Every structure is written in C-alpha cells, then in structure tokens.
Write a protein that binds this ligand. Structure first.
Ligand SMILES: O=C(O)CC[C@H](O)C(=O)O
Ligand SMILES: O=C(O)CC[C@H](O)C(=O)O
Ligand SMILES: O=C(O)CC[C@H](O)C(=O)O
Ligand SMILES: O=C(O)CC[C@H](O)C(=O)O
Ligand SMILES: [Fe+3]
Ligand SMILES: [Fe+3]
Lengths: 349, 349
C-alpha cells in the first residue's frame, strides 16, 4: 500500500546513532520538537563514498561523517574559548521565545511597523559566558544565541586550531564545484532548545558540527510556494513567514504540502546545505549548549548559455530580482505589493 | 446633495448638437448603446481656445471642432473612394457580433486555444463595397469593418485631398509636444452599430471624424485596475477582457468602479486620444456607415531624470515590461502567470 510505503520512508532523522564505547544513545526522539509535516532522512555518508560526491555535485544535502574538517575544534568548549578566543566583540542575540528569527537591520528602515522578537548586543566572550551563567544558575528563561564571524582578532591557540582544519578537503570541494571564494566562517553557540526558523541563503554552506547536537530540517528550492518567504525588502527577507509551531493554513495553505529532509548532526559531522535550500535548525531539547562553525562560499558563476527548463533556484533568483527592480523603479518598496496585485488580479490568477 | 450633484455631472455626450440650417438633431440618445457605468463629457473646444491647448499639453482628451485637419476629405463617401482610392488591397474584418475585438496575429502562436470572433480578408475597394451591398440588399447581418493604413498606392485625387489636410496645425502640435514622427494614418469605414472594444494604444492619436457619427468612451490610464487588459503575450494584448454588454463582476469586480469620459464626434471633429488612454468606439445605431482617419504619432521621449511619484502611464509601462522580461527569462510566455502567482500568493496579497 503506497500510503503505508510512504509512511515508512518518512522516517525523519531515523533511529538515534550509538556512541562508541557503549556510551549510550547519542540523543533520543523526545529531544526533537514536533511539527505538522513529514520528512525523509538526509543520507549520512563517508567523504570517500562516490555517492557523497554525487549529491554535492548535484546540489543535494548530505552529511559527511569523516571529514576531520574541524578536527582541532572538537576540543572547544566554553572554558577553552574564553581563555583563547580573544578580547574582541561578539554579536549575541537574546530572545523571549525559543525562535530566533533573523532580521536585516539595513532593511529595518522601509518597514517601521516591524519589531524584533530578539535583540542584538555586542559582548566580550567572558560577558556572554557570564550572562550565560547568571541565567543558568538563576533558572531564568531568557535565551541567548551567540553568532559571530571569526575575525582577525582571535587568540593564538584558536588561530592554531584554525590552521589544523582540513583545508585540503574543502579547498578541493571549492575547486571541483567552481564555487567562488570562502566568504566567511560563522561561529554559533546556542542554548538547548534554540531554534533558527526556516530560511534560505545565497551561499554554498558546509555546516560543521562541533559540540552538542542539532536537528537540521531542509526543504528543496522548489518548495518556495509552500514556505512563503517575506517580501524581498522586508527585514526578514529569505525567512519563511510560516510559524512551524502554529502554522496558519488560511494565509499559507500550501504549507500543508511541505515535505522536509532531516538529520541530526553531532561532533564531527559536516552537513552540506546547498545554496537556496531552506533549512530550519534546532538545538536538541535539554541537550546542553551547541557549537557549530560554518563555511560560506559564493556560488559558482551562472553558465553563459541558459539551458531549459530553469532549475527551481533560477526561478527564485528571477522572482527576487523582479522585487528588487520594482523597488527601484517605483522609488519605494512599500508599493511593490500594490503594483504586483494590480498586475495579476483578474489577469493571471 | 453630492450624490445628486454627481448624477448631474454624469451627463454623457450631453444634449445632441443641432445641425446648421435647422437640419435637425445630428443624432439622438436611442442611437447610443447602454452600459453599466457613468460618464462625464469630454470638452468640445476651438483649437484657438487656450483650454484646448491646456488639455493636450496635459495629456487629457478634448474634441477640437474647427481644425480643418481633414477638410478635403469631408467630401469622401463610398462612391468617391472607389473611383479614387486605388487598386491596392484593403484589410477588411468580418464578424458575427457587433464587437470587433482586435487580435495580434504574430502573437496567435503562444495561445492556440484562441479563436478569432472576427476574421481578416484582403480586398480591392470595389470588393469591399460589393460585399457591403450584397449584405445590405440581402438584409444579412454579417458586419464588416474596413481598417487599412493609407499607403503609397492610393489614387491621384486621394493624394490631392491628402495634401490639403491641415498639416500646418498638426505639425505644430507634433512640434510643441515633442512627439516623435507620424507613424501612420488609419482609414476606418464601418457599418452602423459597429463597436471597437475598450483598449489602449502606445501612440498619441488625433482621431479625425469624416462621415457619420461615433460615440467615443475613454478611460484614464489610472483605471487599469478596473479594465483588466489581457496578458501582454496574448493576441488581445491591450484590449480589456471585460464584456461591456455583459460584464462579469465576479472575475472583474473593480469594473464596478469604472468612470468614463464620452463624446459623440461628427464630420470635422478631431478627438485627441492621449497615449495610454483606454477608448471604446461605436458607430451610432442606424446612423449609416462611418468614416474616420487617425493620425498616430510616437510619443515624446521619456524625461532623463525620473520625477516622482510616477504617472499612471509609467506604471502601466512598468507592468508591461515585467511581463515581457519574464517572458524572455522563463523562455515561455505560458509560464508568466504561474511565476507571478507564486511571487504574490501569501506574500503580497
Ligand atoms: O565586527 C563584526 O562583528 C563583523 C565582522 C564582519 O562580519 C567580518 O569579519 O567580515
Ligand atoms: O545553526 C544555526 O542555528 C543557523 C545556521 C545558519 O543558518 C547557517 O546557514 O549556517
Ligand atoms: O500592406 C498593408 O496593408 C500594410 C501596410 C503597412 O501598415 C504600412 O503601410 O506601413
Ligand atoms: O474608430 C475605431 O473603431 C477604432 C479607432 C482606433 O482604436 C484608433 O486608435 O484610431
Ligand atoms: Fe542559514
Ligand atoms: Fe485605438
């Protein structure tokens, strides 16, 4: 029965992997939040597996289990980083809810009726750690999520760890895919339960898990119609307007058709998040703090002769450009919507 | 009472003008079709009136009563033209209904499920006149509408009449408005009751009435949202999808808000139809055949520095361009609609 046959391939992250030396289940289902949509698993392969190379060349997610990409960082933890990360400033987001929706500040100018559910604040690593402890011991509920690009200002031992990354492997990946340069490395440290809502990036991403576990739920670019991203000029550009915890099927009917790809990554796993793929990321409930470092690369330059039909991500690119052009022409982003409706109502719908 | 005050300025063409020498009412109300929308009158002025110049400079319709634009052609009629128009071919449209919706043949390729309610056929003027008589005496109901650009091939006396047009006046109009060159002169001869459905042109137009009477109903460019033009790639591009005789308020709800500008033009009147203004044109019921010659001019070049806010016609221009671009990018016009809906549903509506 196809219905049942399907209810089966809709595993999710699957049965929890077992830790070496019989240290028990890495994590368990009750640590995962519950959503309204189905999900099949992202393949977990070895970098030496020809399949893994296949998925990447073909822009599909895959978790590489043995890259040693950030092997030297697997020793990182709060104590170690405070002693060696530097006296530099670290962007730290604070929020009331478990949801840390990203917002673009340079865009906060066009939409003033927008109020951030989470606020940013610069800190010295020890401050973040301090504030983390107050909350921790005082049993508070304020959630924090440090997210900072690793810059010229980190300490000596961190720079050392950095040099020990597996540049041989990734550089070859950058080379074989024609990608552009590495644009940055984002360091993320969050509290258990922290959620990064579904959104997509215009960067190729190698997501290297370091400490703790993270459940990653991705959606292919062709599910744009089911995820309803905010307007291109809105601060939450690229983020989904749908609240996965309380989805509004009236406003977002096609979210009822969404199908995800998930997996739980841990210390040493590297998840390839292809450019334009939506991803929702959550730190397992009661799993402790999580540490991750990503590698963002500019995508490869678009082929000179366009081949048809277009790939989903090229249509998404086209839609974004229309919204931007219209923004410039009308001289005001607020008017994009009204003109678009006028263009389709009774004509294309 | 504003409601009443308004029910009054909603005259229409107004009281029928009286013919010189007490020859009676030029025409009467029962000769006008009945529609669901209100209309105020287009001003009837003298070319020497500073107001007339005001409306034209400001791109608003006006009927000039004394231009002598086509004074020499006021003698034209079927007999005269057959003897002097030429042996050239004349495009003649035939239709079952009184509505002569224009269709672009070069575009009939993308929409094959489109069937012309009226068909074109080349003829020698005498043929058109012959076919006109058969129908006429045989009491048939097949309607014909000759519409042909006046070309290099017209007879000597017609070329003479042409030279006697008031080029001094119009050339000065072309000059003062910065318009481009005269692109053409369309000759129109239709049967009583013939209707040209609401549509807009991307040409400045001086509409010179010659024989018979025509009721002209125009709408400002900012009523785009009430008139629902077909998709830009459709054969009926620029025409309204709304059937003025049987309007579908379900599909076209805003047609309930449409307000027209009308007038009845006769022998010697010249109606200025500004670029992008919608116009519906009908030959009075039982008024005999009608003859008109238009003057189409390219519009003036768009100012180098764009001033805000945009004028309605600039937004219409913007919408058309979006539809065309999307057509090229997707490599197929049929897909424009689906992408536009995906772009607005749950995001901008
Ligand atoms: O100073 C900051 O926190 C921003 C650093 C910037 O993202 C970079 O290093 O390129
Ligand atoms: O790990 C998170 O919570 C956010 C990850 C971020 O979206 C990325 O693209 O690396
Ligand atoms: O030959 C025809 O009927 C088309 C003539 C063309 O419109 C022109 O004269 O520019
Ligand atoms: O007079 C007609 O029936 C059609 C007139 C045509 O739309 C024009 O722009 O001159
Ligand atoms: Fe991301
Ligand atoms: Fe026209």
């Amino acid at each position: 029965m196809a219905a049942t046959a399907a209810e089966a391939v809709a595993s999710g992250s699957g049965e929890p992997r077992e830790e070496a030396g019989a240290l028990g289940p890495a994590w368990d289902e009750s640590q995962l939040r519950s959503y309204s949509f189905p999900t099949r698993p992202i393949p977990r392969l070895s970098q030496s597996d020809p399949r893994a190379e296949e998925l990447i060349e073909n822009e599909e997610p895959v978790v590489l289990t043995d890259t040693n990409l950030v092997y030297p960082a697997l020793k990182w933890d709060l104590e170690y980083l405070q002693e060696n990360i530097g006296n530099g400033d670290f962007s730290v987001y604070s929020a009331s809810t478990h949801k840390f929706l990203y917002y673009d500040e340079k865009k906060m100018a066009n939409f003033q009726n927008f109020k951030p559910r989470s606020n940013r604040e610069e800190m010295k690593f020890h401050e973040f750690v301090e504030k983390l402890q107050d909350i921790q011991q005082r049993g508070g509920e304020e959630r924090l999520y440090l997210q900072q690009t690793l810059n010229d200002t980190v300490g000596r031992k961190i720079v050392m760890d950095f040099l020990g990354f597996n540049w041989n492997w990734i550089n070859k990946q950058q080379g074989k895919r024609g990608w552009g340069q590495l644009t940055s490395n984002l360091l993320l440290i969050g509290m258990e339960g922290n959620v990064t809502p579904a959104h997509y990036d215009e960067q190729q991403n190698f997501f290297a898990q370091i400490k703790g576990y993270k459940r990653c739920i991705l959606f292919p670019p062709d599910q744009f119609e089911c995820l309803y991203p905010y307007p291109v000029h809105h601060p939450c550009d690229r983020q989904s307007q749908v609240d996965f915890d309380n989805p509004d099927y009236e406003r977002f009917p096609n979210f009822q058709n969404v199908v995800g790809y998930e997996t739980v990554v841990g210390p040493g796993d590297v998840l390839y998040i292809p450019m334009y793929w939506w991803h929702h990321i959550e730190s397992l409930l009661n799993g402790g703090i999580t540490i991750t470092v990503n590698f963002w690369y500019k995508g490869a330059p678009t082929p000179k002769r366009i081949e048809y039909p277009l790939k989903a991500h090229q249509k998404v690119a086209i839609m974004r450009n229309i919204e931007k052009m219209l923004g410039e022409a009308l001289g005001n982003p607020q008017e994009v919507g009204p003109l678009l409706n006028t263009m389709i109502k009774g004509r294309y719908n």
